[PDB]
């Protein structure tokens with residue numbers, strides 16, 4: 333019940349918009365594939 | 380929850396035309412965009428949570444999940460993981476934003492990093508709506524270095540996604 337539709341080529345656009353800052357963040361990755369910040373409710377392992 | 384090879388009387392294999400794709404589905408309210416992905420070398424790559432392994436229709440054919448990992452949050456259809464490039468940790472990169480209900484556009488950005496106990500991972504500070512996950516991220520040579528969609532929401536409310544990527548898998552031996 334799920335399908336896919338092509339919508340664009342794979343390529344670098346010379347006139348692409350610029351956005352975002354480069355950050356350095358400490359995280360953990362749990363067994364469920366969740367990144368965790370230190371103060372997130374889910375900080376502290378989990379299955 | 381890491382890694383698993385799927386079990387898929389044949390069927391006609393769906394259209395694997397190279398490119399960027401929108402992952403669609405029908406809900407109780409009509410059709411909408413569940414996520415996105417990138418088709419390369421005859422294989423469809425996307426994050427795990429976009430389809431969660433559901434079989435996909437492409438053209439008059441079907442594509443079955445080949446490999447996937449919830450922990451890596453990656454999933455590919457039609458064959459082993461084909462992407463084989465990664466951020467060189469130096470240049471800016473570009474996300475081919477496949478936002479639900481909007482035309483595709485490219486946005487470049489200078490990646491930062493997620494500091495993991497197992498090392499560092501490229502991380503782009505780009506905030507795009509639910510359903511954009513699977514959107515490919517490319518380097519200046521136009522190679523797919525990873526996917527968008529799995530990250531954290533900083534205390535300041537801004538979202539940061541890791542450049543989700545895995546290493547190329549060999550064909551079944």
Ligand SMILES: *C(=O)[C@H](CCCNC(=N)N)NC(=O)[C@H](CCCCN)NC(=O)[C@H](CCCCN)NC(=O)c1ccc2ccccc2c1
Nearest residue numbers: 365367368372452506507509510511512528529530532538
């Ligand atoms: C994929 O389309 C989707 C894009 C999210 C963009 N978010 C944003 N710009 N803020 N990806 C996700 O939603 C992703 C799923 C992760 C599944 C497990 N690997 N979510 C996140 O990366 C992030 C995690 C935050 C907690 C970390 N400990 N969550 C969200 O971005 C998010 C959470 C809750 C809600 C609720 C309602 C609408 C949107 C969201 C987004």
